[PDB]
Enzyme design. Sequence first.
Site, short mmCIF file in Angstrom:
data_model
loop_
_atom_site.label_atom_id
_atom_site.label_comp_id
_atom_site.label_asym_id
_atom_site.label_seq_id
_atom_site.Cartn_x
_atom_site.Cartn_y
_atom_site.Cartn_z
CG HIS A 40 -0.47 0.26 2.53
ND1 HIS A 40 -0.18 -0.70 3.48
CD2 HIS A 40 -0.21 1.46 3.12
CE1 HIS A 40 0.25 -0.10 4.60
NE2 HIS A 40 0.23 1.21 4.40
CG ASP A 84 0.06 -4.06 2.84
OD1 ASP A 84 0.52 -3.60 1.77
OD2 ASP A 84 -0.24 -3.34 3.80
N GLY A 175 2.38 6.75 8.78
CA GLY A 175 3.76 7.11 8.51
C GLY A 175 4.75 6.01 8.84
CB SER A 177 2.60 2.36 6.10
OG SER A 177 1.32 2.46 6.64
N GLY A 178 4.85 -0.02 6.23
CA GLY A 178 5.92 -0.61 5.44
C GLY A 178 7.20 -0.91 6.21
C1 LIG Z 1 -4.23 1.87 2.64
C2 LIG Z 1 -4.72 1.17 3.89
C3 LIG Z 1 -3.85 -0.07 4.07
C4 LIG Z 1 -4.73 2.12 5.11
C5 LIG Z 1 -3.32 2.57 5.61
C6 LIG Z 1 -3.07 1.70 6.87
C7 LIG Z 1 -4.51 1.33 7.31
O1 LIG Z 1 -4.81 1.00 8.50
N1 LIG Z 1 -5.38 1.62 6.30
C8 LIG Z 1 -6.85 1.55 6.58
C9 LIG Z 1 -7.51 0.22 6.20
C10 LIG Z 1 -7.81 -0.12 4.85
C11 LIG Z 1 -8.45 -1.33 4.49
C12 LIG Z 1 -8.76 -2.20 5.55
C13 LIG Z 1 -8.48 -1.88 6.89
C14 LIG Z 1 -7.85 -0.67 7.24
O2 LIG Z 1 -8.90 -2.89 7.76
C15 LIG Z 1 -9.47 -3.89 6.87
O3 LIG Z 1 -9.37 -3.43 5.49
C16 LIG Z 1 -2.37 2.68 7.82
C17 LIG Z 1 -2.16 2.36 9.27
C18 LIG Z 1 -1.11 1.49 9.66
C19 LIG Z 1 -0.97 1.07 10.98
C20 LIG Z 1 -1.90 1.50 11.96
C21 LIG Z 1 -1.80 1.04 13.30
N2 LIG Z 1 -0.81 0.18 13.70
N3 LIG Z 1 -2.65 1.45 14.24
C22 LIG Z 1 -2.95 2.35 11.58
C23 LIG Z 1 -3.05 2.80 10.25
N4 LIG Z 1 -3.11 3.99 7.65
C24 LIG Z 1 -2.24 5.18 7.98
C25 LIG Z 1 -1.99 5.88 6.63
C26 LIG Z 1 -2.18 4.80 5.59
C27 LIG Z 1 -3.39 4.03 6.17
#
Ligand SMILES: CC(C)[C@@H]1[C@@H]2[C@H](C(=O)N1Cc1ccc3c(c1)OCO3)[C@H](c1ccc(C(=N)N)cc1)N1CCC[C@@H]21
Length: 223
Positions: A40, A84, A175, A177-178
Site C-alpha cells: 500500500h 500487503d 507514517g 507503514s511498510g
Molecule cells: C491503505 C490502507 C492499508 C490504510 C493505511 C493503513 C490502514 O490502516 N489503512 C486503513 C484500512 C484499509 C483497508 C482495511 C483496513 C484498514 O482494515 C481492513 O481493510 C495505515 C495504518 C497502519 C498502521 C496503523 C496502526 N498500527 N494502528 C494504523 C493505520 N493507515 C495510515 C496511513 C495509511 C493508512
Amino acid sequence: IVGGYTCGANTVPYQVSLNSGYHFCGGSLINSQWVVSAAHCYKSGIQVRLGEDNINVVEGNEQFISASKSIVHPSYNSNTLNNDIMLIKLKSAASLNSRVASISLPTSCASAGTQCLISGWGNTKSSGTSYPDVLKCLKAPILSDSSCKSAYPGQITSNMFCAGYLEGGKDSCQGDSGGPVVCSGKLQGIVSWGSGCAQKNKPGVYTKVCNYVSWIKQTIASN
Ligand SMILES: CC(C)[C@@H]1[C@@H]2[C@H](C(=O)N1Cc1ccc3c(c1)OCO3)[C@H](c1ccc(C(=N)N)cc1)N1CCC[C@@H]21
Ligand SMILES: [Ca+2]
C-alpha cells in the site's frame, strides 16, 4: 510510533525511509540492492533514504538512492489488505557499513508472546498529528491468533498477525507503514494496518513475512 522511545542514531541500521519529497513510508534493507515494504506504499518516484536518523537534516551517514523498480505482490488486494508486501530494487547497490546494514529473513514463523522491535518516523499521537524528526522505537509482543481474530472478526487472514497492547497507548501509526517488525534478529513483519492508533482492543496488524520468504527469494533471483 505512539508511546515509543527515541531509538538513538543508526541503532536500527536496516530501517529505510521512502521519500517522494517528504517521508511517506518505511521499509527494511534485506541485501545491498533490495528493500521490503508494504504494497500500500506503492507509488512512482520513490527515493530510498538509508542511514537516516533526523529525516529533516543532513547529518552524515545518509545514502539517497532512487528506486529502479517496485514489485507489488501480484495477489495484493487493496480491499482486504491481504498480501500487503512489496519489493523495491535500488538503482545502485547501497554501501553497507555499521550504520547501513541488512536484516535477515526468518527461517520460521514467530510464536505468540515473542517480543519484537517496531520502528518508524510515523505519527506519535493517538489523537491529532505530531511527526518526529528522529527515528522512534517500540518493543511490542506478537498476540495470539485468537486475540487477533477477536479484535478484528472476519478481517484477519493467514498472512497477517497482531502485535502490540490491548490496553492501548502503544502502537505503530500513520507514517510507519511498510516498516520493520524485527524479532530475535529476524524480519517477521511489515507495518500494514490498524483501526486508528493505540486505541484499546485494537492492536496493530502486520504482514506475516515468514509466509513470503520463498516468494521474495524467487522474485529477487529473477530480477
Ligand atoms: C491503505 C490502507 C492499508 C490504510 C493505511 C493503513 C490502514 O490502516 N489503512 C486503513 C484500512 C484499509 C483497508 C482495511 C483496513 C484498514 O482494515 C481492513 O481493510 C495505515 C495504518 C497502519 C498502521 C496503523 C496502526 N498500527 N494502528 C494504523 C493505520 N493507515 C495510515 C496511513 C495509511 C493508512
Ligand atoms: Ca538525515
